[PDB]
Amino acid sequence: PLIVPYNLPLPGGVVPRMLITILGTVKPNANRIALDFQRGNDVAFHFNPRFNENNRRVIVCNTKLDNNWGREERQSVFPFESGKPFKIQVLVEPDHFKVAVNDAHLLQYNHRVKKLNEISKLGISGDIDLTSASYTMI
Ligand SMILES: OC[C@H]1O[C@@H](O[C@H]2[C@H](O)[C@@H](O)[C@H](O)O[C@@H]2CO)[C@H](O)[C@@H](O)[C@H]1O
């Protein structure tokens, strides 16, 4: 297992056809999970499953620029379950990040940060046991 929060370097940032794969298991009675694709202090793509926001489960996505969160993009399709193993795949496409969970398409997030090759770290945090975090060029 990996220690959470975990930092995965993305050498030379991201680029279309780069696939990032996160394997782990959600803890019992989880509250949150977060992926933070960072460009220095900015967060190009924040992917944040919330297990209890007003007794609803929702995935919140956003970008943080100069310490300011922008407009949230919310997804009520929620494939995670407390206690269960998951796979998150984030595929960088030309106009968006494409996210699949457990081999099922979940959402896309249009690029707000344009300098893809400066998005050089992925932070993985929250109520999970982390098994692996890696990338491959497809
Ligand atoms: O936008 C992602 C960002 O949200 C923060 O929580 C928001 C919350 O979603 C919103 O409903 C409320 O109005 O303000 C909060 C703070 O901006 C999180 O704290 C942060 O971790 C990110 O997930």
From Swiss-Prot:
Residues 6-136 form the Galectin domain. Probably forms homo- or heterodimers. Interacts with DMBT1. Interacts with CD6 and ALCAM. Forms a complex with the ITGA3, ITGB1 and CSPG4. Interacts with LGALS3BP, LYPD3, ZFTRAF1 and UACA. Interacts with TRIM16; this interaction mediates autophagy of damage endomembranes. Interacts with cargo receptor TMED10; the interaction mediates the translocation from the cytoplasm into the ERGIC (endoplasmic reticulum-Golgi intermediate compartment) and thereby secretion. It comes from the Eukaryota. The chain holds residues 113 to 250 of 250 of the full protein. GO terms for molecular function: carbohydrate binding; chemoattractant activity; disaccharide binding; IgE binding; laminin binding; molecular condensate scaffold activity; protein phosphatase binding; protein phosphatase inhibitor activity. It is found in: Cytoplasm; Nucleus; Secreted. One of its GO terms (biological process) is negative regulation of endocytosis. This is Galectin-3. The keyword Cytoplasm applies. A major expression is found in the colonic epithelium. It is also abundant in the activated macrophages. Expressed in fetal membranes. The keyword Cytoplasm applies. Galactose-specific lectin which binds IgE. May mediate with the alpha-3, beta-1 integrin the stimulation by CSPG4 of endothelial cells migration. Together with DMBT1, required for terminal differentiation of columnar epithelial cells during early embryogenesis. In the nucleus: acts as a pre-mRNA splicing factor. Involved in acute inflammatory responses including neutrophil activation and adhesion, chemoattraction of monocytes macrophages, opsonization of apoptotic neutrophils, and activation of mast cells. A motif (Nuclear export signal) lies at residues 114-129. GO terms for cellular component: cell surface; collagen-containing extracellular matrix; cytoplasm; cytosol; extracellular exosome; extracellular region; extracellular space; ficolin-1-rich granule membrane. It comes from Homo sapiens. The modification Phosphoserine is found at residue 76. A beta-D-galactoside binds at residues 69-75.
